[PDB]
Paper text:
The dedicator of cytokinesis (DOCK)/engulfment and cell motility (ELMO) complex serves as a guanine nucleotide exchange factor (GEF) for the GTPase Rac. [name], another GTPase, activates the ELMO-DOCK-Rac pathway during engulfment and migration. The DOCK-A (DOCK1/2/5) and DOCK-B (DOCK3/4) subfamilies specifically activate Rac and have an Src homology domain at their N-terminus; the Src homology domain is involved in autoinhibition and binding to engulfment and cell motility (ELMO) scaffold proteins. ELMO is structurally divided into two domains: an N-terminal domain (NTD), consisting of the Ras-binding (RBD), ELMO inhibitory (EID), and ELMO domains, and a C-terminal domain (CTD), consisting of the Pleckstrin homology (PH) domain and proline-rich region.
We performed 3D variability analysis using the 3.8 Å-resolution consensus map of [name]/[name]/[name]/[name]. Next, to capture representative conformations of the [name]/ELMO1CTD/[name] core region, we divided the [name]/[name]/[name]/[name] consensus map into 10 classes by 3D classification. Five classes of sufficient quality were obtained with resolutions ranging from 4.2 to 4.5 Å and subjected to atomic model building and refinement. The resulting structures of classes 1 to 5 differed from one another in dimeric molecular dimensions. Structural differences were due to the conformational changes between the armadillo repeat domain and DHR-2 in [name], accompanied by a shift in the PH domain of [name]. Consistent with this theory, our cryo-EM single particle analysis reveals that the [name]/ELMO1CTD/[name] core region is highly flexible and can, therefore, readily transition to a flatter conformation.
Numbering used by the authors:
A (entry chain E): 819 to 1368
B (entry chain D): 530 to 727
C (entry chain E): 1 to 269
Write the structure that this text describes.
């Protein structure tokens, strides 16, 4: 109730005397008494009489900052989470008022005195179910009210570079864990969009700080760009044409009100990538893939601006091509391209534009760009293959067509010898056949995989190490597991001749290399069962028809 | 509302084709249909599913399934859509004229519908009640590409057409439509647009 | 056709009936074909149509109900009353999307919500029509605004449509990047509306007493209306009927006695 008087008390008293008197009374509170009540008190306090600020804001706040920074982390912040959020929200709102008075420098002070604090909070305040959204709102409000000149004022001008580095790391990971796994019901679309704008502003500022304190002028400690670009790309990975499409005005509404965020984001990333300069090569192979999907964005323009970066990347390798060529580039390129296109992202015009731009770029350049031209021809062949595959998959949905096209792509990969994705589609087809219980065909496929292996003991390539389980797996052991499964299939596949055939080699391997005679015994038990089946039971003969497509 | 009614019914077809495609969806999702005289341990319920291609019908003596259609190879997955002469509804059904053990009572008079095919084979089927009976007949005539025979279909026609025309008369609020169309001002024959196109 | 001049005082290109297809760029133009005309002729108008905002059509001036107004109704003071017209345009777009999801509805066995959408639609369109006039009292204005906002946001909520804010004065001020935190609290106000009406769907759409409790928790004064029809008694003399509310538990009356005089003829005196 002491706050309840402050309005008319001000109306008949000196303002700053009231300010200092209340400040003194509040600081006089012992640090473990009615924290909830005192926070409510200062909430009502900052509510009124703060419509005028020049005499009190600067002096009432410091105590407020002090108790809120104690509220940052004293390990007793559980009850006062919401209370602190309430305080911060209300005061920030009051600050946003324009008629109340000039506060830009005061905003600077608030930055200096709570920004790191609240970022620390949210980085710790990490569980979604509580009112974390309140803290998010507070901090985005801060950043929106904030100024870029203010941004660089102190946050750029901290102590030793390691502190600012760690701060920047935390900031970026926090941004990623916000953009990823968002905090809103996805129905607060306006709020989501606003959050996107403020995040844009902040990451812009942190881009210039990277340019000015972590470019070549920082001769080393130049790793972050991994994290930074990851954050940027992830932020570039929502709010897309279809979402924009749900109402026809939806595109128009957001464009009029906000335009194409993705446009600016991609352009920014493009120019800063160019700014990376010498470190591009020291930075290519990891980050190659992270730019395809943004290139694969359904729009037109920033795509136009983005494909050239692929040529920039291959050229950067050409600078490093003293040892080889962009093989290490194009391998990851092809891989990620594969997962993305099969994911159902690109478009025909996309591949056309790719061919056009890359060929045009390489014409300007030398022999290595001619090799790149032929590899881009390869790329376009891949793309048309994948488009055909996906269109048929979405079109007919008849398992037969699915097998047809997946075999098509498998043959193409076998032709292109890119064996890992080859195996991936092999397993795809195996899944298909298991769905159709075509145990024979499944066994043939799985064999075709196992054919790649050797009874050698060294696992030579982890490419054959698939995603079903991933650890040492000597080529021997993996081959053994494969043969076990295949024999099982052939057994329930009711076709035992090949079963016995393969049992023979497996027993040979057992006896000659592993000497596990127990496996010998079980295997030969199975083989005897096989021979019994063959001689004993009878199997129907399947009719074979010829089909004439005309 | 004379220009209103003329304009309303004159832009007809969209609602009609929407209704028909809805009927198509209904036929494809189908249900367990009703047989004849399924008393002595005979499956009265059995699903009749239309192909997503809407060219074959997945039906047969399926079991008493209360869940409805099961997606699989029905006892016969083909009904020749391209040659169906018609479906007889009511007394035209020869099974209704049966006077032996397949006597359908007069209570299935509006559940009698038999698909005509092979010029001698018929599919004397029964619907659980009237609305879906009319629905299936509507779906068949949609495959036949002619008018509908569901009262609910005419209901939908009138109601949705009324909704659409009602949501168009918003521009013409506080305005009147001359029943005689407004006279056409003489367009100058020159097409030399002083201002540029687009 | 010649002499076209760009202007924005023709946003409301209003047809009369299905236009003749005389132009190579015109058709049986719909009644609601509000077209963003770009170029104006004296007797004709060519410009973008609502149906295709990338394609023109030369359209008779006699056929156009010319309206100088634009999407803004206050610069030219087109408002029948300020702070309400934004609401009508937004609800028109809202009815557009209602129609689209309606299209999507019949093709699905969402018929229950489909008919509840029908009756929502009828309520909303009649409210729209009744507020087409500015005759209502300001309390009626506010109440209409609030309830139609509730209903439209309800339509949004079961249909998984996004949310709007700024309850009053057009639902537009809040989305105008005025602040951040007010945006927040408005969003949670809306979410509170969402939760209220979703939990009360099973309360009102099924039961009928929880609604009475909720409504009566907002007001305090009530009046029991009684309409006497006929007195049926064998007295034969002048009778005074003292009908009043009574508390049998408290053994006392609750309302003052309303004296009714009854004649000796069977008829009230």
């Amino acid at each position: 109730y002491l706050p309840s008087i402050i309005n008319d008390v001000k109306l008949v008293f000196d303002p700053v005397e009231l300010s200092v008197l209340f400040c003194k009374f509040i600081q006089s509170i012992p640090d473990n008494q009615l924290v909830r009540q005192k926070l409510n008190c200062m909430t009502k306090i900052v509510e009124s009489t703060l419509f005028r600020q020049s005499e009190c804001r600067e002096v009432l706040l410091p105590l407020l900052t002090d108790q809120l920074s104690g509220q940052l982390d004293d390990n007793s912040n559980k009850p006062d989470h919401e209370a602190s959020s309430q305080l911060l929200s209300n005061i920030l709102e009051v600050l946003d008022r324009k008629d109340v008075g000039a506060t830009a420098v005061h905003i600077q002070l608030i930055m200096e005195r709570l920004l790191r604090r609240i970022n620390r909070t949210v980085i710790g305040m990490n569980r979604q179910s509580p009112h974390i959204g309140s803290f998010v709102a507070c901090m985005i409000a801060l950043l929106q009210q904030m100024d870029d000149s203010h941004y660089s004022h102190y946050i750029s001008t901290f102590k030793t570079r390691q502190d600012i580095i760690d701060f920047l790391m935390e900031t970026f990971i926090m941004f990623k864990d916000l953009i990823g796994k968002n905090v809103y019901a996805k129905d607060w679309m306006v709020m989501n969009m606003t959050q996107n704008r403020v995040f844009l502003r902040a990451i812009n500022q942190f881009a210039e700080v990277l340019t000015r304190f972590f470019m070549d002028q920082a001769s080393f400690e130049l790793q972050l760009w991994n994290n930074y670009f990851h954050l940027a790309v992830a932020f570039l990975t929502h709010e897309s044409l279809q979402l924009e499409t749900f109402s026809q005005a939806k595109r128009n509404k957001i464009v009029k009100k906000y335009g194409d965020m993705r446009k600016e984001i991609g352009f920014r990333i493009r120019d800063m990538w160019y700014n990376l300069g010498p470190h591009k090569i020291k930075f290519i192979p990891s980050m190659v893939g992270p730019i395809l999907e943004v290139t694969l964005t359904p729009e037109v323009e920033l795509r136009k601006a983005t494909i050239p970066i692929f040529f920039d990347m291959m050229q950067c390798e050409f600078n490093f091509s003293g040892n080889g060529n962009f093989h290490m580039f194009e391998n990851e390129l092809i891989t990620k391209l594969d997962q993305e296109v099969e994911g159902g992202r690109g478009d025909e015009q996309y591949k056309v534009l790719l061919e056009k731009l890359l060929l045009e770029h390489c014409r300007k350049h030398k022999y290595l760009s001619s090799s790149g031209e032929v590899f881009a021809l390869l790329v376009s062949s891949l793309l048309e293959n994948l488009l055909d595959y996906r269109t048929i998959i979405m079109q007919d949905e008849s398992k037969e067509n699915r097998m047809s096209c997946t075999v098509n792509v498998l043959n193409f990969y076998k032709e292109k010898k890119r064996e890992d994705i080859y195996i991936r589609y092999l397993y795809k087809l195996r899944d298909l056949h298991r769905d159709c219980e075509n145990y024979t065909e499944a066994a043939y496929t799985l064999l075709l995989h196992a054919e790649l292996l050797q009874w050698s003991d060294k696992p030579c390539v982890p490419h054959l190490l698939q995603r079903d389980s991933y650890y040492v797996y000597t080529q021997q052991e993996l081959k053994e597991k494969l043969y076990q499964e295949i024999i099982s299939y052939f057994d329930k596949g009711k076709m035992w001749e090949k079963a016995i055939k393969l049992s023979k080699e497996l027993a040979e391997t057992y006896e000659s290399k592993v000497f596990d005679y127990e496996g010998l015994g079980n295997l030969l038990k199975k083989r005897a069962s096989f021979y019994e089946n063959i001689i004993k039971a009878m199997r129907p003969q399947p009719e074979y028809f010829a089909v004439g497509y005309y | 509302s004379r220009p209103i009614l003329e304009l309303k019914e004159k832009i007809q077809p969209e609602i009609l084709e929407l209704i028909k495609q809805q009927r198509l969806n209904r036929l494809v999702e189908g249900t367990c249909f009703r047989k004849l005289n399924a008393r002595r341990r005979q499956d009265k319920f059995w699903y009749c599913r239309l192909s997503p291609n809407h060219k074959v019908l997945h039906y047969g003596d399926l079991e008493e399934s209360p869940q409805g259609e099961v997606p699989h190879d029905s006892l016969q997955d083909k009904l020749p859509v391209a040659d169906i002469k018609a479906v007889v509804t009511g007394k035209d059904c020869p099974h209704m004229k049966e006077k032996g053990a397949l006597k359908q009572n007069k209570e299935v008079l509006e559940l009698a519908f038999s698909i005509l095919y092979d010029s001698n084979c018929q599919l004397n089927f029964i619907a659980p009640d009237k609305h879906e009976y009319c629905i299936w007949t509507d779906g068949l005539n949609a495959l036949l590409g002619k008018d509908m025979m569901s009262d609910l279909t005419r209901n939908d026609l009138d109601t949705l057409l009324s909704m659409e025309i009602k949501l168009r008369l918003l521009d013409l609020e506080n305005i009147q439509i001359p029943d005689a169309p407004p006279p056409i001002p003489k367009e100058p024959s020159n097409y030399d647009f002083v201002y540029d196109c687009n | 056709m010649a002499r076209w001049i760009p202007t924005k005082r023709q946003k409301y290109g209003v047809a009369i009936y299905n236009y003749n297809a005389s132009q190579d760029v015109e058709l049986s133009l719909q009644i609601g074909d509000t077209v963003h005309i770009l170029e104006m002729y004296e007797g004709w108008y060519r410009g973008y149509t609502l149906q295709n905002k990338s394609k023109k059509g030369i359209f008779p001036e006699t056929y156009i109900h010319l309206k100088e107004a634009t999407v803004e109704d206050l610069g030219q003071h087109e408002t029948v009353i300020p702070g309400e017209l934004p609401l009508v345009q937004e609800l028109t777009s809202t009815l557009r999307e209602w129609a689209v999801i309606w299209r999507k509805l019949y093709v699905n066995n969402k018929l229950t919500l489909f008919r509840q959408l029908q009756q929502m639609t009828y309520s909303l369109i009649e409210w729209r029509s009744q507020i087409l006039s500015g005759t209502l009292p300001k309390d009626e204005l506010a109440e209409l605004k609030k309830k139609v906002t509730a209903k439209i946001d309800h339509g949004n909520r079961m249909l998984g449509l996004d949310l709007v804010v700024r309850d009053d004065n057009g639902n537009i001020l809040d989305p105008d990047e005025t602040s951040t935190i007010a945006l927040f609290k408005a969003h949670e106000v809306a979410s509170k509306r969402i939760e209220e009406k979703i939990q009360e769907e099973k309360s009102i759409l099924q039961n009928l007493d929880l609604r009475g409790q909720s409504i009566f928790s907002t007001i305090h004064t009530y009046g029991l209306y009684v309409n006497f029809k006929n007195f049926v008694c064998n007295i034969g003399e002048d009778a005074e009927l003292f009908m009043a509310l009574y508390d049998p538990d408290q053994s006392t009356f609750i309302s003052e006695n309303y004296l009714i005089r009854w004649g000796s003829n069977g008829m009230p005196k």
